Amino acid sequence: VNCETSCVQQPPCFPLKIPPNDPRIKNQADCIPFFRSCPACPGSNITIRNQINALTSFVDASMVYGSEEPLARNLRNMSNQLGLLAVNQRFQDNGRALLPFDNLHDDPCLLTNRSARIPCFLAGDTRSSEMPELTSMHTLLLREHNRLATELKSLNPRWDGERLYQEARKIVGAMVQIITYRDYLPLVLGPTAMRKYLPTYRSYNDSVDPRIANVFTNAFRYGHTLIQPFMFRLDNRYQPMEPNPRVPLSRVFFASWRVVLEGGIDPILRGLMATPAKLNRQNQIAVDEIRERLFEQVMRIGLDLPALNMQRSRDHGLPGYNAWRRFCGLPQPETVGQLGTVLRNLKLARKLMEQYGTPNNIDIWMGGVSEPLKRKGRVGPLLACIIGTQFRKLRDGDRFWWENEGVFSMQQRQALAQISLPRIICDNTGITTVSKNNIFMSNSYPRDFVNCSTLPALNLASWRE
Amino acid sequence: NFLEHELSYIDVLLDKNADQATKDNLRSYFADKGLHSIKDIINKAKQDGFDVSKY
Amino acid sequence: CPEQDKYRTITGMCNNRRSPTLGASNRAFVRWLPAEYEDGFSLPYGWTPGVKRNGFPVALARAVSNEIVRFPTDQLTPDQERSLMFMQWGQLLDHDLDFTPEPAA
Ligand SMILES: *[C@@H]1O[C@H](CO[C@@H]2O[C@@H](C)[C@@H](O)[C@@H](O)[C@@H]2O)[C@@H](O[C@@H]2O[C@H](CO)[C@@H](O[C@@H]3O[C@H](CO[C@H]4O[C@H](CO)[C@@H](O)[C@H](O)[C@@H]4O)[C@@H](O)[C@H](O[C@H]4O[C@H](CO)[C@@H](O)[C@H](O)[C@@H]4O)[C@@H]3O)[C@H](O)[C@H]2NC(C)=O)[C@H](O)[C@H]1NC(C)=O
Ligand code: HEM
Ligand SMILES: *[C@@H]1O[C@H](CO)[C@@H](O[C@@H]2O[C@H](CO)[C@@H](O)[C@H](O)[C@H]2NC(C)=O)[C@H](O)[C@H]1NC(C)=O
Ligand SMILES: *[C@@H]1O[C@H](CO)[C@@H](O[C@@H]2O[C@H](CO)[C@@H](O)[C@H](O)[C@H]2NC(C)=O)[C@H](O)[C@H]1NC(C)=O
Ligand SMILES: [Ca+2]
Ligand SMILES: [Cl-]
Ligand SMILES: [Cl-]
Numbered sequence: 001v002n003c004e005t006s007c008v009q010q011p012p013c014f015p016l017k018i019p020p021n022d023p024r025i026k027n028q029a030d031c032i033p034f035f036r037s038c039p040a041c042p043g044s045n046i047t048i049r050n051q052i053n054a055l056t057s058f059v060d061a062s063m064v065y066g067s068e069e070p071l072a073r074n075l076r077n078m079s080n081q082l083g084l085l086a087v088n089q090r091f092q093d094n095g096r097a098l099l100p101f102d103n104l105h106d107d108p109c110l111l112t113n114r115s116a117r118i119p120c121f122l123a124g125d126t127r128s129s130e131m132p133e134l135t136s137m138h139t140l141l142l143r144e145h146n147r148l149a150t151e152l153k154s155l156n157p158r159w160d161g162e163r164l165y166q167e168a169r170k171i172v173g174a175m176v177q178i179i180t181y182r183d184y185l186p187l188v189l190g191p192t193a194m195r196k197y198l199p200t201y202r203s204y205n206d207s208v209d210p211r212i213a214n215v216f217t218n219a220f221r222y223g224h225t226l227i228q229p230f231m232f233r234l235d236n237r238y239q240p241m242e243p244n245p246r247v248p249l250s251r252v253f254f255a256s257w258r259v260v261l262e263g264g265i266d267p268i269l270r271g272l273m274a275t276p277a278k279l280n281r282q283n284q285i286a287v288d289e290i291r292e293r294l295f296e297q298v299m300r301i302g303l304d305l306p307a308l309n310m311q312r313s314r315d316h317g318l319p320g321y322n323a324w325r326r327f328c329g330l331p332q333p334e335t336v337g338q339l340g341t342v343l344r345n346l347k348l349a350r351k352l353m354e355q356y357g358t359p360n361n362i363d364i365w366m367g368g369v370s371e372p373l374k375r376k377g378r379v380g381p382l383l384a385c386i387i388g389t390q391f392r393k394l395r396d397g398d399r400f401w402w403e404n405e406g407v408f409s410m411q412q413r414q415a416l417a418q419i420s421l422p423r424i425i426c427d428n429t430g431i432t433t434v435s436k437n438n439i440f441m442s443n444s445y446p447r448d449f450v451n452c453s454t455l456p457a458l459n460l461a462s463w464r465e
Numbered sequence: 466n467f468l469e470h471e472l473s474y475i476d477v478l479l480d481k482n483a484d485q486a487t488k489d490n491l492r493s494y495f496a497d498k499g500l501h502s503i504k505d506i507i508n509k510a511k512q513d514g515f516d517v518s519k520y
Numbered sequence: 521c522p523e524q525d526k527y528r529t530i531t532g533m534c535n536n537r538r539s540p541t542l543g544a545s546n547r548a549f550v551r552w553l554p555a556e557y558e559d560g561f562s563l564p565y566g567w568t569p570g571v572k573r574n575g576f577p578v579a580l581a582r583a584v585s586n587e588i589v590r591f592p593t594d595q596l597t598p599d600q601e602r603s604l605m606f607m608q609w610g611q612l613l614d615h616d617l618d619f620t621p622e623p624a625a
Binding site: 002003004009012014016017018019022023025032035036037038040045047048049050051052053054055056057058059060061062063065066067068069072125126127128130131133134137138166169170173176179180184187188206209210211212213214215216217220223226227228229232271272273274275276277278279281283284285286287288289291304306307308309310311312314315316317318319320323324327348351352354355356357358360361363366370376378394397398399400421435439440441442443 | 527537542543544547548555560562564567576582583584591593601605606609612615616619621
Binding site for chain 2: 070078079080086087088100102103104122
């Protein structure tokens with residue numbers, strides 16, 4: 001039973017059935033394909049089924065470097081002692097590096113513009129080509145690695161390729177930590193949850209379990225509520241970049257050709273800085289581009305990403321909403337009325353009860369994204385709890401966390417405090433005007449924008465011999 | 466599975482100019498993936514759908 | 521595990537000295553709560569037709585999507601206080617944290 005094309009329910013296929021009055025899938029014998037996540041213990045009648053994490057849980061830039069030894073070596077430029085990551089050998093972006101090409105049997109990217117014959121990219125994680133915006137962030141970090149390694153080679157002539165690689169890697173890893181915990185997470189959780197779930201870092205605690213919890217894989221998908229139905233590209237005047245300034249998302253999934261042949265990462269990064277995120281609202285949860293048209297260009301039918309989230313939680317055996325509420329120490333609504341209070345929305349409570357019958361059965365993603373947002377945050381209490389708890393464990397339980405004593409010198413720590421995603425954009429692209437303040441808040445050109453010349457470079461002096 | 470960027474390493478292995486140190490580093494990297502001679506390397510490139518007609 | 525190190529391993533192996541797989545790749549997620557499957561151990565809710573979850577019919581994920589998630593795209597609300605970069609960093613970060621493998625067909 002081939003899950004991509006069959007609608008039969010046999011292991012490992014758990015296809016989503018089609019409701020009687022579907023707006024899109026008019027044929028009820030059709031289905032949305034779904035493969036059950038690989039079990040930790042295949043074919044066991046003893047164990048309770050659990051899923052596998054293929055990556056390091058640590059915030060360690062594993063999406064740049066890889067999480068398995070063979071792939072990590074493959075992403076490296078092995079033709080010199082310069083400690084560089086491998087770059088594309090056939091294509092450049094205005095004289096700057098692109099990600100190398102990957103060699104998949106069944107390459108989704110070739111399906112997006114057949115004539116262009118541009119394959120998917122190779123990165124540390126397998127999803128780098130899922131959207132050009134994501135590819136752009138990957139390309140950015142590759143560039144940054146190479147720049148750090150270059151600079152370190154000047155500072156320390158006698159260091160070999162192994163040392164250069166490791167040191168640049170350690171800095172990129174620290175940058176991801178800083179941007180994540182200083183800039184990103186406060187805007188996710190809001191001030192109150194940030195204080196509750198992420199108090200000031202003390203030291204590495206070796207008794208903190210740093211594993212990703214199963215639920216986190218589902219709750220972190222709150223992000224799907226932020227997705228805009230277009231990819232936006234802007235020229236160097238931050239003007240719409242001709243033609244196709246607003247490309248529908250359904251025409252960009254795996255569209256790696258767009259990066260290579262439609263003008264590189266610059267216009268993509270500009271679009272990211274100078275366009276608003278979508279606001280999650282209680283009757284505006286997620287756009288049709290992901291709910292109706294996910295991967296429509298590479299697959300036999302458009303998938304439904306919200307529906308996939310819900311299917312996947314069931315696949316993973318996740319408890320429903322009330323059980324997570326109780327886990328988090330929050331009240332658990334029993335009735336339509338009480339769910340109305342918790343959601344600050346009786347209409348939505350009525351709708352959730354009509355589907356689910358009890359708040360005990362609401363799937364974690366659906367319940368999580370339904371909750372009103374915390375002041376100055378983009379998750380409600382439930383999601384703030386799960387997300388916050390996970391990031392606590394990621395920081396406290398990481399021996400190589402950037403502020404852990406003996407990881408960096410004090411001067412290196414001082415130097416690292418100066419980094420920002422805007423600075424990274426300046427260092428590694430043709431972009432000369434970037435977002436000020438907090439990159440994740442600033443969104444309007446010109447009001448929120450600064451010249452690159454105003455931003456402190458990362459000073460590598462304290463990495464010397 | 467052979468990667469397009471690895472073709473550039475073949476080029477370095479066939480550069481009579483490129484120094485012994487660099488070439489032995491690359492041979493070592495290919496030997497780690499079960500590829501012992503340049504013939505074995507070209508062959509893998511061919512079989513993974515790359516155009517090797519230059520060699 | 522080694523005694524002296526300076527850098528993270530690729531796999532995350534050996535980050536925690538006492539329990540060296542913790543955070544390493546190709547390992548089971550941790551469970552904060554006991555799993556909830558139709559049969560207790562394996563089958564997902566929704567698997568067997570007419571099997572209730574805790575007294576109620578399991579709703580089709582696609583039905584939930586249609587009734588709750590769907591909205592008109594022309595009514596989309598820009599977030600005044602967040603950039604698309606805020607979205608993108610999130611997906612990027614997610615790809616540092618977790619990938620759940622599925623079988624090849
Ligand atoms: C280093 O981190 C350790 C883990 O820290 C947790 O994760 C981090 C990221 C933070 O969120 C942190 O706040 C977390 O606690 C940490 O050790 C932890 O210390 C707590 C507090 O001492 C321990 O909790 C105690 O547990 C025992 C045993 O019961 C537990 O296990 C069962 C089954 O899992 C559960 O059903 C229980 O609810 C518990 O979780 C309890 O007997 C005890 O409670 C009793 O005593 C208190 C205080 O007198 C009363 O208020 C209660 O009502 C009870 O009568 C605590 O709940 C926790 O088990 C322990 N975790 C580990 C892994 O050891 C450590 O202290 C940190 N070190 C430093 C220096 O920061
Ligand atoms: C352009 C943005 C995004 C997508 C396209 C996209 C797509 C997916 C898909 C297809 C899955 C798998 C669905 C399934 O269960 O079959 C998926 C899972 C995960 N997401 Fe999605 N996503 C996009 C964007 C985001 C953003 C902004 C996120 C967070 C802020 C985010 C999170 C996640 C996570 C954590 C997962 C699960 C990953 C895993 O396999 O563990 N995504 N996404
Ligand atoms: C490994 O590093 C070297 C040095 O950075 C790369 O060589 C450059 O490649 C570009 C693209 O082919 C050329 O235009 C330059 O002339 C090269 N310059 C130097 C300094 O040699 C090489 O391409 C890298 N290889 C990989 C696999 O990433
Ligand atoms: C598919 O990719 C091709 C190849 O890159 C695109 O062709 C370019 O299209 C623009 C605008 O139509 C022209 O100015 C270029 O000269 C084209 N180049 C080539 C090599 O033909 C084509 O537009 C893409 N199709 C889609 C669906 O956008
Ligand atoms: Ca990681
Ligand atoms: Cl994906
Ligand atoms: Cl298909």
